[PDB]
Amino acid sequence: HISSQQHEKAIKSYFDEAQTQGVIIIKEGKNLSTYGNALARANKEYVPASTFKMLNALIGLENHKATTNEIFKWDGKKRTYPMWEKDMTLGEAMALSAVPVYQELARRTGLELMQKEVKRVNFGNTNIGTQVDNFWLVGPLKITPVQEVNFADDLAHNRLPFKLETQEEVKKMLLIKEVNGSKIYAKSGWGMGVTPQVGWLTGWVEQANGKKIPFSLNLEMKEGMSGSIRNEITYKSLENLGII
């Protein structure tokens, strides 16, 4: 019974109250819906930041640069965050957003193959530049929220150009929340190497009946915001729309 005006006002208020500017794009079948407090962000380009780990993992597994059980050993050097000072599989590194592990994977893939594969998937502006280990953090690779939700839609439905098994293995790494009978698969991003900083949460809800509803949240991370605001706004928005 809830009007579209009320859903739009509610979701906008979640971004307003977090003192940020952002959008969340929802896709139902082929139809995009855009909510939030800065709708024009929907077709603007931002660095993908750690959302690129979804594609990095697909590329590295497909090309035999790692297995899902391989343990990437911590090299013993101090990390930016202490939670990264440990040995990790790709899936554990996905959950911790452990940049160093995915930088190792990118170096195994190498610039030539990485560029070919990013072009082959047609991800964002497709440009990785000359540095195989940081192009998703500081540019030149960029992507819009519409492109991110369409990438999530492709992955959720096994439509990316990788083996089915590769896509299933990466999707298993993305389960972040179980709500009643729904499952939320997503990857966060926080681009601290750019100004303004960008925050992302891109993924999909798998409902109990099996329908998959992709989404992409994109906002501005401000001084002293918590990363959990990305999750909190996303979950509140999905709940307001009755998706979870």
Ligand SMILES: *[B]([O])([O])[C]([C][C])[N]S(=O)(=O)[C]C1=[C]C(C([O])=O)=[C][C]=[C]1
């Ligand atoms: B990534 O998560 O976006 C990674 C590389 C840009 N972000 S970071 O290392 O600069 C800060 C960070 C963010 C997150 C997150 O949840 O996205 C997790 C750990 C560290």
